Amino acid sequence: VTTFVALYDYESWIETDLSFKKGERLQIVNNTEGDWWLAHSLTTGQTGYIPSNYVAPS
């Protein structure tokens, strides 16, 4: 539906976060409410929380 792209690298020490590379495609699992979103990587297949301000619709 709506695909998002990472705007910056994100590496987290919280293992339930999704870490990702600038340019990687991600998707939202729930909705766009909140500053932290449950997300899924379209490249690694992993699911985890991400900061909303690190991604944009592509």
Numbering used by the authors: 83 to 140
Copy the relevant paper text.
Cellular Src kinase (c-Src) is one of the most representative members of the Src-family kinases (SFKs), a group of non­receptor tyrosine kinases that mediate responses to extracellular stimuli, phosphorylating a broad range of downstream substrates. Although v-Src shares 95% sequence identity with c-Src, this kinase shows uncontrollable activity that is responsible for the occurrence of sarcoma in chickens.
Besides the v-Src SH3 domain bearing all of the mutations, we have cloned domains with (i) only the oncogenic mutations in the RT loop (v-Src SH3 N117D-V124L; c-Src SH3 R95W-T96I, based on the sequence of the non-oncogenic variant c-Src) and (ii) those in the n-Src and distal loop (v-Src SH3 W95R-I96T; c-Src SH3 D117N-L124V). In this mutant, the n-Src loop conformation is similar to that found in chain A of c-Src SH3. As expected, the most significant differences are found in the RT loop, in which the oncogenic mutations Arg95Trp and Thr96Ile are located. In c-Src SH3, the hydrogen bond in the type I β-turn occurs between Thr96 and Asp99 through their side-chain and backbone atoms, respectively. Nevertheless, in v-Src SH3 the substitution of threonine by isoleucine prevents hydrogen-bond formation by its side chain, and in this case the type I β-turn shows a hydrogen bond between the backbone atoms Ile96 O and Asp99 N. However, we could not obtain the intertwined dimer structure of v-Src SH3 bearing the oncogenic mutations in the RT loop, even with crystals obtained using the same crystallization conditions. Instead, we only obtained the monomeric form, and both mutants had only a single molecule in the asymmetric unit. The reason for the lack of intertwined dimers of these mutants can be found in the role played by Arg95 and Thr96 in the stabilization of the dimeric structure. Neither tryptophan nor isoleucine can form interactions to stabilize the intertwined dimer.
